[PDB]
RNA sequence: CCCCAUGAAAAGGGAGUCUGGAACGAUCCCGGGAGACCGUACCUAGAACCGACACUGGUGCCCGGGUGAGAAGCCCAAG
RNA sequence: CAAAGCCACGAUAGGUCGCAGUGACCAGAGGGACCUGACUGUUUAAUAAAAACAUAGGUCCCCGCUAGCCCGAAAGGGUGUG
């Protein structure tokens, strides 16, 4: 798993911060999205709601932010991630 | 002579009575025939109780307040009745449990509200079943027996460790029971007069009788050493 | 000795120093159960915690989460 | 009458051409109005101390404007 | 998806709840809609993304077009009162 | 920031939502009318209260300059 | 920022007077040995403030709520909104 994640980052264009994908996936220009367990709940349902919406695959991530933005490698979490170029890696069909 | 201080407190006077509207309210289970499921709104803090609340809304419209039960949240949904099942919090009845099971507040018979296990630390297990009713432990290890749709809840009542933290101070001692009807501070008698003291008078001060007595003994005699086992540190 | 000496040389080292050691593990960082040990959570009584991002009261211990 | 709480201790020198100073009394403040569910800090509302029958004024065009914000009360409609 | 003709629905403003039409996509954060005939009618007003809640019906329109047309489209699904229903 | 102390309740107001009613109709402004009854003097204390008194006792409460940390002491403003 | 007017504070040099330079006023004597009480606290109004009481702590006893504890004639009362 981690081994495909680590080649996303290290070429395929990637989406920080729930904003901008959230802005974004409404519009469904977004290949996918992985949240960790620890998004707030209000949010959750809205991203679930708005997966059906243009049917855009999710991976439910049983981590937190921090695992997740460890992987990431930035120092703090990252609460979700938004994805526009899977690049190599073999992550979509998740 | 005038009578003892364990006796001024048979007048039912002011200096022994509750001041509870500074409390938040009677926190015993609301009576529910059915299965129900209810959500957490708010925790307070009770002062005369030495163990947090909860404020719990009713799926049917209902407001009630049990002890609260350890690592519950506001918004976290409690079903309560026969159907739930064992899970934290959850308030259920002593005829689905297993054996061995942890949970606290069980009620004595049905609709009653809940007599034992009710402050903080504490918890209740399950030593066996009985023929009409169930086998419970208190932490005083002794046993009692309730009906079987007695009511209970899964989990610890909150305030662990509760007197690990010295009170360090007679100050806290005095906010300690500012409000509960405890007389402060506790005055020992053998040094009163004996005008108002079975063991008061005397210029050396010593024990005059034997304090143990026989269980006849009139009140306001009972002093001291009242039906003990045995004595000694060992 | 730090937070052992907050009230000076009264009431007993002995007593000062079990008061001392369970008094950090109150101030010691915790991890926060709902959103996470990001921020931290404070006691404002026996039981009661919650930190100033999940902002989910929940139930504790006398001085433990 | 004897000293207390209802009235904040004010005088008179400022905007003030005559020549005299002396004090006055008035009551303390309010706030936005009283109950608790979502214990949110509201806004938008009207609070004085007088009230100007001012009928929107005092409360948001919003569906439940003067009611609450959003973050407590999906629970209705 | 946000998709031009979904009819949707808005969190906020003075509708706060009644229903307009989807025309076109003026950029990533706003697009213009209409509710022709509410019972305020609400005029031709674009809106931030994050203020509107997509619903389960669409409706096939061109790129912005008019409000007679909607005013057609719409009925010829037949959805003229379910503009609450949606 | 502190709490094993968690720090009052009503009436009185204002708003929100749903039902019924009639079509006239205002929490707008403009003009008009009214708004019980009773408290209301004085003294607040080295002479107005109590202590048997025109009593160094107590019962209060609240509030300029300089010198000077200062409501300390001194002196002097208002009186 | 820095200049100007103000204003407070904190230092430097020099000269100079007297016995006296926190000039008045206001304003700890200090040190050592020992006993007792752990301490702050409280109390003999109008002969006594202390080592007398409370204290934080250790320790034991009673008791599973229709308990235990105590009060009244009785209804029952209060520790019990536990």
Redesign the pocket.
Same mark, same amino acid.
């Given at each position: 798993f981690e081994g495909e994640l680590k080649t996303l980052l290290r070429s395929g264009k990637v989406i920080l911060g729930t904003r901008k994908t959230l802005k974004l996936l409404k519009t469904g220009k977004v290949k996918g999205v992985v949240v960790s367990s620890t998004l707030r709940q209000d949010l959750k349902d809205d991203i679930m709601t708005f997966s059906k919406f243009s049917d855009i695959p999710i991976y439910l991530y049983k981590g937190s932010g921090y695992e997740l933005g460890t992987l990431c490698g930035k120092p703090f979490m990252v609460s979700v991630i938004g994805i526009v170029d899977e690049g190599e890696s073999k992550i979509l069909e998740f | 002579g005038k009578?003892l201080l364990?006796?001024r407190?048979?007048? $039912?006077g002011i200096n022994?009575? /509750?001041p509870?509207?500074?409390?938040? %309210? *009677?926190?015993?289970y609301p009576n529910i025939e059915g299965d129900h499921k209810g959500k957490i709104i708010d925790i307070? +803090?009770?002062? $005369?109780? &030495?163990?947090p609340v909860v404020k719990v809304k009713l799926d049917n419209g209902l407001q009630f307040?049990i *002890?609260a039960v350890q690592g519950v949240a506001v918004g976290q949904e409690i079903s309560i009745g026969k159907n739930a099942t064992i899970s934290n919090g959850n308030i259920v009845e002593v005829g689905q449990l297993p054996e061995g099971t942890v949970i606290c507040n069980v009620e004595?018979?049905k609709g009653? %509200?809940g007599?034992?296990?009710?402050?903080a630390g504490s918890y209740a297990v399950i030593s066996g079943k009985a023929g009409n009713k169930v086998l419970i432990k208190? /932490? #005083?290890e002794?046993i009692?027996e309730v009906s079987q749709n007695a009511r209970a809840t899964v989990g610890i009542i909150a305030g662990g460790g509760?007197?690990e933290?010295?009170?360090?101070?007679? %100050?806290?001692?005095y906010?300690?029971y500012?409000?509960?009807?405890?007389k402060w *501070?506790?005055?020992?008698g053998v040094?009163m007069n004996a005008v108002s003291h079975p063991h008061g008078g005397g210029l050396h001060?010593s024990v005059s009788r034997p304090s143990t007595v026989s269980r006849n003994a009139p *009140?306001?005699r009972?002093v001291g +050493?009242?039906? #003990?086992?045995? &004595? $000694?540190?060992r | 000795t730090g937070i052992a000496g907050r009230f000076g040389a009264?009431?007993?080292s002995s007593?000062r120093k079990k008061w001392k050691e369970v008094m950090e593990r109150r101030?010691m960082p915790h991890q926060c159960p709902y959103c996470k040990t990001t921020g931290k959570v404070?006691?404002?009584?026996?039981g009661?915690w919650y930190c100033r991002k999940c902002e989910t009261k929940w139930a504790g211990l006398?001085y433990t989460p | 009458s004897?000293?207390q709480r209802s009235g904040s201790f004010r005088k008179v020198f400022v905007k003030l051409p005559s020549g005299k100073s002396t004090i006055h009394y008035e009551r303390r403040k309010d706030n936005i109005?009283?109950?608790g569910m979502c214990k949110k800090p509201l806004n938008g509302?009207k609070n004085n101390y007088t009230?100007?029958?001012?009928?929107?004024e005092?409360?948001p065009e919003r569906?439940?404007?003067?009611?609450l914000c959003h973050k407590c009360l999906e629970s209705?409609? | 998806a946000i998709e031009i003709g979904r009819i949707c629905v808005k969190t906020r403003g003075r509708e706060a709840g009644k229903k307009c039409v989807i025309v076109d996509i003026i950029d990533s954060n706003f697009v213009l809609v209409t509710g022709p005939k509410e019972i305020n009618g609400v005029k031709r007003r674009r809106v931030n993304i994050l203020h509107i809640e997509p619903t389960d019906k669409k409706v096939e329109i061109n790129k912005g077009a008019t409000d007679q047309e909607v005013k057609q489209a719409i009925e010829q699904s037949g959805l003229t009162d379910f503009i609450k229903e949606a």
């Open positions: - | 009578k364990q006796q407190a048979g007048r $039912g022994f009575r /509750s509870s509207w500074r409390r938040v %309210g *009677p926190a015993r307070l +803090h009770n002062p $005369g109780v &030495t163990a307040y *002890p004595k018979l009653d %509200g007599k034992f296990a009710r402050a208190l /932490s #005083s002794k009692v509760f007197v933290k010295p009170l360090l101070k007679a %100050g806290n001692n906010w300690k500012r409000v509960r009807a405890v *501070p506790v005055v020992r040094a001060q *009140p306001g009972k +050493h009242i039906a #003990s086992r045995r &004595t $000694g540190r | 009264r009431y007993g007593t101030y404070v006691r404002i009584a026996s009661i006398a | 004897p000293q109005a009283r109950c509302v009230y100007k029958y001012s009928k929107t005092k409360r569906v439940y404007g003067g009611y209705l409609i | -």
